[PDB]
Amino acid sequence: HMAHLLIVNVASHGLILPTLTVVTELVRRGHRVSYVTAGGFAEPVRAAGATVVPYQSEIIDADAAEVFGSDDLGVRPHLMYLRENVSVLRATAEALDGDVPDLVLYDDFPFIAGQLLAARWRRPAVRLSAAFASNEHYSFSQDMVTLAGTIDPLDLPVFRDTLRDLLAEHGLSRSVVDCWNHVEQLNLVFVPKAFQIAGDTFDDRFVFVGPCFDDRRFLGEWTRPADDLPVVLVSLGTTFNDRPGFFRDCARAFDGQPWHVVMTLGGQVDPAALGDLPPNVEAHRWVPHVKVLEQATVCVTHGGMGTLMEALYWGRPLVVVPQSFDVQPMARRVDQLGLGAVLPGEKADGDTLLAAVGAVAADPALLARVEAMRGHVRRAGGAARAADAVEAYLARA
Template sequence: MGKHVLYASIPAWGHVYPALEGLTELVRRGHRVSALASGSFAAEIGKVVDVVPYESPMDSVQVELSDMGNVLPLMLKETRAAYAMLAKAVREDRPDVIVSDVLSTAGWLLGQAFDIPVIRTWPVFASNAEFSLHQDYESRSDTDESMLAFFGAVAEFLDEVGLASSVSPEQFFDNEAERNIVLFPREIQPKGETFDDRFTFIDPCIRPAENSPELPWLRKASPLAVISLGTVFNEKIGFFRTCIEGVERLGWHAAAALGNKVSPQAVGPISDRVLLRAKLPMIDTLQHASVAITHGGLTSTIEALAQGVPVLIAPQIGEQRGVADSMERLGLGVRLREPFTADELADLIKQVANDTEMAERLARFQQKLRDGRSGGQFADAVEAAF
């Protein structure tokens, strides 16, 4: 008999996409899946699972997210909004298990409040006693003062929802689950050998190609370099200009995802060998690419590897430095150190494109990523909690 699975994540495609095929597989197996979804996420998520709609403060964020003084209050606001809607949904239709993204504290708290098993999903590097992203890559910049204020606000929230006696404010960051699904192979994880059987590493769930209107241009664009800084730390007009100039010096084509903070006009005049979009159909684009110049988001990096595309990573935050280190350790890409010139980038692209040993490693790793059952492995791990 099918079970009811409730999935909770923050509104960020880098966190949702890696789990979506696994949730779809659970539906194929006869389970009922409900998923928290806000704004523009609801339409795509609603194609495969039932939607629990809510209004997320993250959808209209206007603050600088590199400052933890802004991030911490935003995450608490997100938790409040998500928890209110999830608690209502659970009271009306209790799930058998909660699958909660590592950044969805609301999902974990819901399990504590209603005594429901929680499975944590990790689309970013997992943490244990041997490895901590925050400590090993200094991904937090909070101060004693900001943390004191933040934990005070968290304590008030926990009291409001009746969890003050069982959950400490510090657990807002360090909450643990006995079951964890890491949404990428163990080889990519720093100190992967130290993670015990509470952590199930799976082959990634790669989303299908979009079959987008850009396909005719992409099919003719060879060789092609993809340029993207993700959706958060991407307000770098100079970066895009230098990358496009470096690619064009090689006579290559370039497709750049600028995000919603940089306009094509700001990047400047371009030739017909360049495609500028706020958001690229990324799988379509990667399937035609020879190299990806990226910030090193883990989900976007794995999507490139799954298409056999080497990555040149210009990290913007601590986690992305970790991804760059892992790619260099595995010989699947190189770190792009800023600042760099167009000539330096062109030389590095040529070096990577002509590296036959890297190409062989990429082909082997691509086969590993594509040979697995991806969504099936995810569903197996969830069903083990029933």
């Protein structure tokens, strides 16, 4: 049974955090795990039991708002995406050509490097999805392309040509379009099937294990106040979070109000830049959302899948304030399932947020649906089921 498992991934919070417990459970079962990452993420990855395979990352330093704002076609993001994939591919082949893994597990983002390594080494592969899974019916990629307003990457000759030669030099007998729309034989999705868009269309190639998490001390620590105010998490995530005005207006509206607000900035905005905060309002660069959500009454989030799932794991009603294309599908789905109030873009000013937080906290119908979804999240199976699926896949392969 014992195997050398490689996890191909890139330098991003949302993509890495869900995988940590899974790494640990596998190491516990006596498997060896190599994990591709960069920079500061190396530390938590090792602590989870994995051997780190460093690659030079471009996204880890990038500002997504700026990248997608650079040109009006998205040429810059498209080509950065390829480079990040290529950087990952080269580093991993270098490190592991001599220590070839039995299984290649790759996140959605580096799926090109994922397929290429699996083919180069003649190994089975597993795709990991930290957001919505994609199949022949629903494509999360297309959804994001359309919502982002960029050109279709395959309508970009230079992108298409690069990818083409990349497959060519690697002898992969697969066309660009088929490579791009490749559905792997096994998929681990960190979402409950009930939340997945078009969930019922997903067959046995997909295992919906939902979220799985530790205390995540590496994100700092947190304890609720010694008072009786209901706690409210407020976060714009880690990606499109350069929004001082938003956090300031939030603190202002909640000033003197019957809530305790915990705001997380995600490494972008400086807490000081907010000015003086009401006594019932905290501001941090980082605190574990799981620890706040355990004590929380309401979760205000832009719609990052991690935060949504950590929130629904505790059955907290939602106020989703999407400020960008990458979370529009998550927010749309929460709205569809009636799991919270959605305040898109400009709508999410402080006063509107104050009312929404109050509304969802006291909506009995909404609360029922949130408690039911919590159920689905709990049944998902998390890390243990992921590992079970992996080991069963190994047995077949």
